[model samples]
Target: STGSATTTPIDSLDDAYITPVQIGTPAQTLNLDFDTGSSDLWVFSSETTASEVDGQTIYTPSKSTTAKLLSGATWSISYGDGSSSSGDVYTDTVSVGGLTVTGQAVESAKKVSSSFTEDSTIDGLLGLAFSTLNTVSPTQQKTFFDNAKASLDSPVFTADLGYHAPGTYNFGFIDTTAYTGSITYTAVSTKQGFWEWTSTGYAVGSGTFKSTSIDGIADTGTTLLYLPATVVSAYWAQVSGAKSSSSVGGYVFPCSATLPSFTFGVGSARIVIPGDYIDFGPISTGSSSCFGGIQSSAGIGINIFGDVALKAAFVVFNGATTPTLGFASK
Candidate 1:
């Protein structure tokens, strides 16, 4: 969607934006709107023009004695939203919370687009998602987990998104002592390093929708939790004032009272999506209500559970043992 024919623009924006938590001595600070779609940690640079680097945070290499940059390698990243930027590669001793990682490869975009330049609230992005889609390389690419794995007191990296309230998305060790209670864990997989699944069926409210079988990936990178057409339509039918409107997009409904809670099955786990997440922003051009997270990427042929869905659960990407993903309650 970068308006380029060469790049595949994935329309699905799920957990596309995340807050980058800077691990420091006193405590870490969370920088929101960080991207997890790709694995490239970038922030604005002081050398950038004020117009180009307007609202973004620029990490000065001089600020951190541990910061280091690799020479000779050039990097560029373009988002599906037509946002693009490029910079040189460098390594630094980056720290998050009490954890510190040396020789971490980071991208310093020399030129940034408006999306990054316009927003000056937060510093930059720290990608904690899967490595398969990462922009970093094996010899040079080092994830927050890859860097802190050995130093962390525990081996687990858990994230709890606070969509409803102040929730915690943490890395490093999992405090099993806190959850002394028995916990069930699904085995990790080596393929893609994403939470893979085979859908049993789709259900809405208390009724069963499509009985079709579906297999897809659970991506935090996407914004909306997308499913097969039949499944999405089946669920939409249950909404009281929900109606299909062409103006807004595909299936859209009128925002009446709060919509009923819906649950999609992920193996034995029933992931309940909050009704508010479905009640999107105001609609234009028609009476049909806009969905909080709905779009027409059905042709893409993959069901993605984006940020709206992931923010409700505690997610763990356990790459140490194997390339597996685990989910737990916050």
Candidate 2:
């Protein structure tokens, strides 16, 4: 049997797409960001300081008889956005759609960063990267997918994100309807605990395709597409009033300026990112200033192909022995 879940974007396309998940017995339901950049299932819970909880639904272990304490266990995680959380561990049932994983490590947050404590739409994060990335202390923990893989028809998951529309994350069996055309596959490396791959260069606008290999990741947890500083500069150079700004956030361009499409090469295959998607949204909620969805990962030193890039295509994350990514047009 296969299971699929609908994911909804938060704060326009400037953030992650999240879905509802059930944790513990009697089910403490919560909305979690499905992140492929890290591995750990953590949530705001009764343990969290009331000040940090915000308007999120908190997970309560006392209400679930199935909640079992993991002796001397703990977890801590920090995101590139400077948000972080640390918590104790509890093994219980966690479910998404029709599939359920028992004895899943559910980290209950005792403390959270201001970055996470403020925005209330999120309750937790479900890490879907390789199991090695899990943050449990002493003994490493397994992700929900890692535990459920043996029971799946095929150890695969597909991400079908949309442009402000409801998207689906299919587990086990691939739902061919979400995408058109055959999937073009490329090998990936999970050694760094990410679905990392090297792009066969890219072109700004309809410019020439260079053979400049770029090492990057396919991360659903992040919001924008990040590359080298030179690349971020190259793409924004043609835009009329675009400038890298700290106040407006990243590269800001005139709202009326028509942006150019970015094409990423995978071997000989080419997947183009539409210009419309390039302009994420207004810098803030009601402003005329817009931020380029593409940015530089100069400080981090790792390029990330986040939601903006992923939504441009249908992605199949094959976690089998080969660990390949199959991409196709939407």
Candidate 3:
């Protein structure tokens, strides 16, 4: 079986992507963030604090005839940015883009962080990372992709994120029309429960491609691209008036400055990110200084190929027994 769903950008800045998911027998639909960085399918629900509810959609498990409480099961998750949530667990029929999973673990939020409350567009998060990362305690649970892979024609899923455009996430089979060239497959390390891989190197604009190995994770949950300080410095140096700003907490440059494109390697294939994508957005509502899409990963501990980089190509999360990642330019 195969399933495909369209992911739409929630804001003009393309800060995040949201895809519709149906939970329970009655088919309560909610817009969820398809996060590849974490492995917990959590949602805002009736149990959430009233004050923390904000304007997001909430799933009512009691209304679904198929829903059952997973007695004594609970889950808690925290992200790199310190955003967090914790909740009890339930088992119910969950479906996405026509693919259905019976008795799927659905974490219902009891409490959430301020960041979650602030984001009105995202009703929940659908994790695509490995099941080893699932936060359910007592007994770990499988991710939606993991639970559905066996029934799928192929144990794989693809992400085609776009800039200011709706992209598609396909499961079971790869969509040939989604990409333009042959995919470059690379070994993946699931040691940390992330889609971690190494890049061949990178190049700034027309500069020579630097032949170096850079380790990073393909994280759709994160909004910006983060690389080693050396690589980030090299790219920023080429842009006139660009500087790391303490106030902005990242590299910022005059919005009018001509930005250069960024290129990173996957196996021997090179994927180029347009300059406009690098410009990111302004530091303040009306400020002339713009934050860079690519930032230093020195303090973050690991490099992250986030939405800024993922949007440049078609990505495949191959969940075969020996998992691997495939990249292709589109």
Residue 153, model 1: Cα distance from true site in angstroms: 3.5
Runs off by more than 4 Å, candidate 2? 246-249
- Cα deviation at 310, candidate 3, in Å, is 0.6
TM-score of 1: 0.78
What are the per-residue Cα lDDT tens digits for candidate 1 across 13-98? Answer: 23334454453223234353434445667666665666786655566665555655576766666754477777777677555544
User: How much is the lDDT of residue 65 in candidate 1?
Assistant: 58
What are the per-residue Cα lDDT tens digits for candidate 2 across 55-167? 98999999999999999999999888888999899999998988889899999999999988887898999999998989899889998888988888999888888777779
Better candidate by lDDT, 2 or 3? 3
- Candidate 1's clash total is 23
Predictions in order: lDDT = 0.56, 0.88, 0.95
Q: Ten residues in a row with the worst lDDT in model 1?
A: 1-10
1 or 2, which is superior by lDDT?
2
All candidates: TM-score = 0.78, 0.96, 0.99
Off by over 4 Å in 1: 1-20, 23-36, 80-82, 136-140, 175-184, 187-195, 209-213, 240-247, 284-288, 294-296
- Give candidate 3's whole-model lDDT: 0.95
Superposed Cα deviation of residue 200, candidate 1 (Å): 3.8
The per-residue C-alpha lDDT of model 2 at residue 102 equals: 88
